[PDB]
């Protein structure tokens, strides 16, 4: 029965280790992502949460019929 239908314990052992490593990495990544999101929303210095500002290319840098603009 063991030869025909089942395998050794080493296979399940090492598969369990691989699964545990994947899940632990995923958990640490989720926590890190939450912290990064909080920091980016608080500060705004990162790529995320970059709300638009007025484009400076719309400014007209020409004499304005009045020296004091």
């Amino acid at each position: 029965i063991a030869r025909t239908f089942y395998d050794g314990p080493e296979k399940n052992y090492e598969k369990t280790m691989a699964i545990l490593q994947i899940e632990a990495e995923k958990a640490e990544l989720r926590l890190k992502e939450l912290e990064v999101r909080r920091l980016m929303r608080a500060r705004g210095d990162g790529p995320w949460y970059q709300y638009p500002t007025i484009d400076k290319a719309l400014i007209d840098h020409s004499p304005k019929t009045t020296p004091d603009n």
């Binding site: 994947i22 990495e25 210095d45 990162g46 790529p47």
Partner: protein, 57 residues
């Protein structure tokens, strides 16, 4: 010996030569804040996919 200017002359844009130095900062501007650094590097696939709850990709 004065000649009256013709039409279209007094409205011309003319060059003027002066010794007055060009102002360095007439608007009295401050130092602009430093921008966000860049998005540098090569894109790599997401680590363990989406990582959303039970999904494996």
């Amino acid at each position: 010996g004065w000649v009256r200017p013709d039409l279209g002359e007094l409205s011309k844009v003319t060059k003027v030569k002066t010794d007055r130095p060009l102002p360095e900062n007439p608007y009295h501007s401050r130092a602009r804040p430093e921008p966000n650094p860049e998005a540098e590097g090569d894109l790599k696939p997401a680590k363990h996919g989406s990582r959303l709850f039970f999904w494996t990709m």
